[PDB]
């Protein structure tokens with residue numbers, strides 16, 4: 001029978017072993033989801049791009065056959081959708097309401113603020129020190145960098161960043177009880193509702209204010225929509241950002257020649273980030289669709305109302321596109337084809353430019369501030385996310 005999906009990673013920092021075998025022998029195949037239903041799994045870069053862009057395929061989760069991967073996903077599909085789950089024309093109608101903050105030009109203008117945020121958190125880490133033992137690079141740095149930035153862009157005042165960063169981490173931490181995670185989730189929603197009310201009365205220079213002035217007050221959306229769009233911008237990317245920073249540090253520890261290159265030349269940070277986002281595809285389960293009508297993909301017929309999962313993680317190890325795909329090599333010559341860490345097509349990550357700027361700032365600065373930063377536990381003992389989840393690192397003891 002069809003194998004259960006998601007697959008488990010072969011080891012902490014490695015993709016599922018199944019993908020390489022499927023790319024070679026069965027690139028479009030059926031898998032079994034948690035509820036016994038079937039879906040198609042696409043593994044080759046060319047086919048992943050096809051799934052991401054076909055207008056015969058839908059992200060609408062109330063359609064029959066949509067591939068929810070967990071009971072929690074089926075429950076969430078009942079809520080009013082935001083743009084992540086919309087097809088044209090609704091998709092860009094709502095996405096355009098927030099895209100201006102994320103353009104290449106806007107993100108370029110944010111660089112001094114990004115640098116300041118990274119610098120301030122690194123100085124706090126230096127002041128705290130590691131004189132009594134290792135400290136957790138996740139809690140002290142990888143978590144607050146993306147958290148403080150997206151909260152600040154949404155509209156949160158500086159004084160509230162540390163508490164709300166903690167609450168949002170509790171929301172997804174593997175140690176939280178269900179009650180703890182749900183209380184934190186509701187706390188964030190309650191806070192954002194009050195902030196939306198505040199910015200309806202007195203807008204400021206932030207995303208929530210622009211939504212209030214330009215969309216809520218004219219009746220294009222309502223205030224509960226503004227809350228859910230802000231919430232989506234917070235939760236869609238934050239845990240992924242945290243994992244990418246931590247995975248970057250662990251990857252450099254595993255590749256000491258390339259770490260020495262980067263220590264000697266911080267201008268290598270953009271190339272490091274490009275290879276990191278290809279090699280550790282920390283969001284691998286988001287390119288999902290159902291077929292609105294029959295669609296042929298390779299040697300398979302995907303029938304109407306059947307579900308499809310396109311693995312950008314597998315695409316990013318596709319030997320036909322990326323030579324020596326399973327070697328981490330930030331000095332590689334890149335091919336014409338895009339790496340797919342941020343997806344592809346209309347739904348390609350709204351924050352791709354922001355995310356790359358955050359990661360570039362981190363990795364051009366971290367080792368200038370801390371030239372002797374070391375992972376404090378044996379690399380084989382790093383606490384990765386459980387193997388049946390997206391790749392990530394839960395905590396990362398360091399000294400410096």
Ligand code: HEM
Nearest residue numbers: 084233236237283286341342343344347348349350351355
């Ligand atoms: C390195 C960090 C990140 C990675 C690897 C990443 C990856 C992804 C991927 C794979 C998708 C799916 C794209 C598709 O459907 O083809 C996506 C979508 C999305 N991401 Fe991220 N992301 C990152 C950071 C962020 C951040 C920081 C934010 C918010 C500030 C964010 C917000 C979103 C949203 C809202 C979508 C849905 C876009 C749409 O469907 O129109 N992401 N991201």
